[PDB]
Design a protein around this ligand. Structure first.
Ligand code: NI
Length: 341
């Protein structure tokens, strides 16, 4: 049974609600992005209308084989009428194809559903600037002040400088980057660009990347591992055992691996500056954990919400415990008292 925070009142609509069977009253199923916790339940046998971005719709058709007649892609930043209700899709600054949804209810209520997002000041000049929002369905993944991390630009600068240093010292080092979903593609694309290489990967991952509308992608990626000195591997193989095994397969081309694990936040963030980050090393293998986030930090979240001044907030993440829910409600009331709405 579908929970309340996935239903849009006054409509036939749900958001990211594919794992509950046929939801009573639902005439259109929105999907904010192509991450498994959100698409859970979609397959080629789905027969209701799915509304989403063009990029999400490429992935539904090619990766999950959803039939074309049930895929309804909408352009961003454009007023669209769906089943008699005005909606707008906005870039969420999450993974490729990720959106926020603005719903203009027939009674005059305006609702914003952020999906998963990384709040940015640039959102304060989208179509959000123009009008008031009564209800906010908020990605609260890192809704606590201990959650700090650097800008994505600082993290990419660290990774580029680390990779270029290592490979210039040893032209025989291979760079490996972990992945387990879409998102965070800048990590491996920025490193391959500094090294003058294409990124090498499995056929399954190449196919996924080919759905993302990234400009000049055929110039940047390949399935020919032998021609590439930046390889992608599943995240589960980014450990000393899995990397050793991989280096065996490379036919004595390389004698060292430098590997990156983009994580979200980790508690080493509460002590260490990005500049000061060091790897774990075993012999000729080094592994860096880098804090590349596609979700708001606490401070970014707070800034966005204080600017928007919603009347009510409904969290969509960390909702399963009373301690989580009570923590989040306390921060929402602080933010409202400090800003005066
Ligand atoms: Ni996500």
């Amino acid at each position: 049974t579908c929970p309340f925070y996935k239903k849009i009142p006054g409509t036939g609509f749900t958001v990211d609600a594919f794992q509950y069977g046929v939801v009573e009253g639902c005439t259109a199923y929105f999907l904010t992005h192509f991450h498994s916790d959100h698409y859970a339940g979609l397959s080629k046998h789905f027969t209701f209308p799915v509304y989403c971005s063009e990029i999400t719709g490429n992935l539904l058709k090619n990766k999950l084989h959803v039939q074309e007649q049930y895929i309804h892609p909408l352009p961003l930043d454009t007023e669209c009428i769906v089943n008699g209700v005005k909606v707008v899709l906005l870039d969420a600054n999450h993974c490729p194809g990720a959106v926020m949804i603005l719903f203009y209810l027939p009674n005059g209520t305006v609702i914003l559903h952020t999906g998963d997002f990384r709040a940015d000041p640039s959102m304060e000049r989208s179509l959000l600037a123009d009008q008031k929002v009564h209800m906010l369905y908020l990605d609260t993944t890192y809704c606590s002040p201990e959650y700090t991390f650097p800008s994505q630009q600082e993290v990419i600068r660290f990774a580029i400088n680390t990779a270029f240093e290592a490979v210039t010292l040893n032209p025989h080092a291979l760079v490996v980057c972990g992945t387990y979903s879409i998102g965070k593609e800048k990590v491996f694309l920025a490193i391959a660009d500094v090294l003058g290489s294409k990124v090498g990967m499995s056929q399954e991952k190449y196919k996924t990347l080919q759905c993302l509308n990234i400009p000049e992608i055929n110039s940047l990626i390949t399935t020919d591992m032998c021609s590439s000195l930046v390889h992608l591997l599943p995240m589960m193989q980014i450990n000393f055992k899995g990397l050793q095994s991989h280096l065996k397969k490379c036919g004595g081309k390389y004698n060292q691996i430098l590997a990156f694990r983009p994580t979200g936040w980790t508690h080493s963030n509460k002590f260490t500056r990005i500049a000061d980050v060091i790897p774990q090393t075993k012999g000729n293998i080094s592994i860096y954990g880098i804090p590349y986030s596609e979700h708001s930090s606490y401070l970014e979240m707070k800034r966005f919400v204080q600017w928007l001044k919603p009347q009510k907030i409904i969290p969509t993440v960390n909702v399963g415990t009373w301690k989580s829910r009570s923590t989040m409600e306390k921060y929402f009331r602080e933010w409202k008292l400090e800003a005066g709405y």
